[PDB]
Fold:
Amino acid sequence: IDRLITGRLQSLQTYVTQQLIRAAEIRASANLAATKMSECVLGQSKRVDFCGKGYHLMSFPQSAPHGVVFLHVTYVPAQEKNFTTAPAICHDGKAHFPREGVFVSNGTHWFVTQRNFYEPQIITTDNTFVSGNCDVVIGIVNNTVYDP
Amino acid sequence: IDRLITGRLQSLQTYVTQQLIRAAEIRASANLAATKMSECVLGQSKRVDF
Amino acid sequence: STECSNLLLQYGSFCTQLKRALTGIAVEQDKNTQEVFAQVKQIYKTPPIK
Amino acid sequence: STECSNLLLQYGSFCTQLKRALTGIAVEQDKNTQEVFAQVKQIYKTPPIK
Amino acid sequence: MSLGAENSVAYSNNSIAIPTNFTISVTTEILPVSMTKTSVDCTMYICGD
Amino acid sequence: AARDLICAQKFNGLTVLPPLLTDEMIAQYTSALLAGTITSGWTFGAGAALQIPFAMQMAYRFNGIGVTQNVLYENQKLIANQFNSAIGKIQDSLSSTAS
Ligand SMILES: *[C@@H]1O[C@H](CO)[C@@H](O[C@@H]2O[C@H](CO)[C@@H](O)[C@H](O)[C@H]2NC(C)=O)[C@H](O)[C@H]1NC(C)=O
Ligand SMILES: *[C@@H]1O[C@H](CO)[C@@H](O[C@@H]2O[C@H](CO)[C@@H](O)[C@H](O)[C@H]2NC(C)=O)[C@H](O)[C@H]1NC(C)=O
Ligand SMILES: *[C@@H]1O[C@H](CO)[C@@H](O)[C@H](O)[C@H]1NC(C)=O
Ligand SMILES: *[C@@H]1O[C@H](CO)[C@@H](O)[C@H](O)[C@H]1NC(C)=O
Ligand SMILES: *[C@@H]1O[C@H](CO)[C@@H](O)[C@H](O)[C@H]1NC(C)=O
Structure:
């Protein structure tokens, strides 16, 4: 009986130790799931590759046996085109930098457009600001800037 | 032989339990490194001291 | 030794669960390395101009 | 007890690995407190105006 | 084993590429939360009345 | 005559399995990540890789941290020299100190 008691006690202690380690792993995954519920679903996340692959827009929770399932809605750019760019535009001895965007060119004319989508616009003084002269910035180009 | 078997079984069980705990610690460090590769290298992070 | 194996067979399935734990650790290490380093879908390269 | 020490010496190196584990935990606690609280490099103090 | 398809981006010091369209993609992520709760009686398991 | 520790470890029934990914494949993955980061910015982590000049990528990073991009475009050589000196310093600190 003492032999059997020692063997069954060892078996039960092994089971309890394995259950404790698996419970620690499950608690780590549950903490990650709670963080994902707080940040993906209840808001919008700027963290890269958190809340899915791409630029995160929305997330939805779904129930599951012994877990949770997230449906991450993301924004993926699709069709790109080659363009010629420049860091600044030299106009009347002044360096013009874009406010929020990027200078592009279709070969002949220069446009300023946003970075994640191709929506070209005429370079005016409303979307560009002035800082310095044209002999400091490397790669500056000559163009006119429309004044409304 | 039974005494030697019990001693070596206890030694092997202790080694396996220690390796399991070390594996949990290494997996936590690997998850942190994967998050750092996802956020630092693949983008720009606004989190302070990350 | 055959007699030691015949006496060790009386102790049940401790060897099988030790082998299962070590196999789980060994698979988990490759999973850690794969989830840290294999984050890019294509193998990019630098142009020869530097 | 000398007889118990002589009989305990036959069991190998359980005592050393248990002492190593407890020493690792003891160092880890001080590392935890240092990495939580000691995030600042200089001891700033409040001006006398409040 | 093969790590992936070989790619070589056309880097230049006056060339940029800007997307003109997009896709809306929905992905799925599964995370365990809890496991099955257990309770063991010693006297019934080891001895059995 | 000088028996190794690894020989006794192997002979007593303990076997060390090789990793699935060799160090050459790890270096290839790291090289791909570096080439994507250098030549495409953050665009290779959200879809297809989009080329951009590195100075304009650095101006995007400075606009990210809250500094106007004319600070980069008028101080580009100083920032490049500071980065090259920092990489030289981290090489020296890695070669000298062994801890
Ligand atoms: C770049 O875009 C501009 C503006 O869209 C183009 O200029 C116009 O092109 C049309 C097409 O012949 C003409 O009818 C307009 O008179 C042009 N506008 C001006 C102000 O000249 C330009 O052709 C485009 N360049 C290329 C190479 O496609
Ligand atoms: C942007 O992409 C969408 C698809 O994601 C394009 O929409 C498709 O256009 C083709 C061409 O006319 C149609 O045959 C499909 O039925 C459209 N799919 C839809 C409406 O779901 C869209 O044309 C693209 N925009 C461009 C190229 O400017
Ligand atoms: C842009 O130019 C490169 C090299 O000139 C070419 O390989 C590529 O197909 C072009 N188009 C796009 C959309 O990248
Ligand atoms: C831009 O105009 C100025 C003055 O008109 C001239 O000195 C400069 O060479 C021009 N830039 C280029 C690239 O020709
Ligand atoms: C820009 O690139 C071209 C071709 O790669 C090269 O000839 C030129 O020297 C580069 N510009 C500078 C300032 O090095």
Summary: DSSP finds two helices and no strands in chain D. The longest helix of chain D spans residues 14-37. Chains D and A do not touch (no CB pair under 8 Å). Residues 34 and 41 of chain D are 12 Å apart (CA to CA).
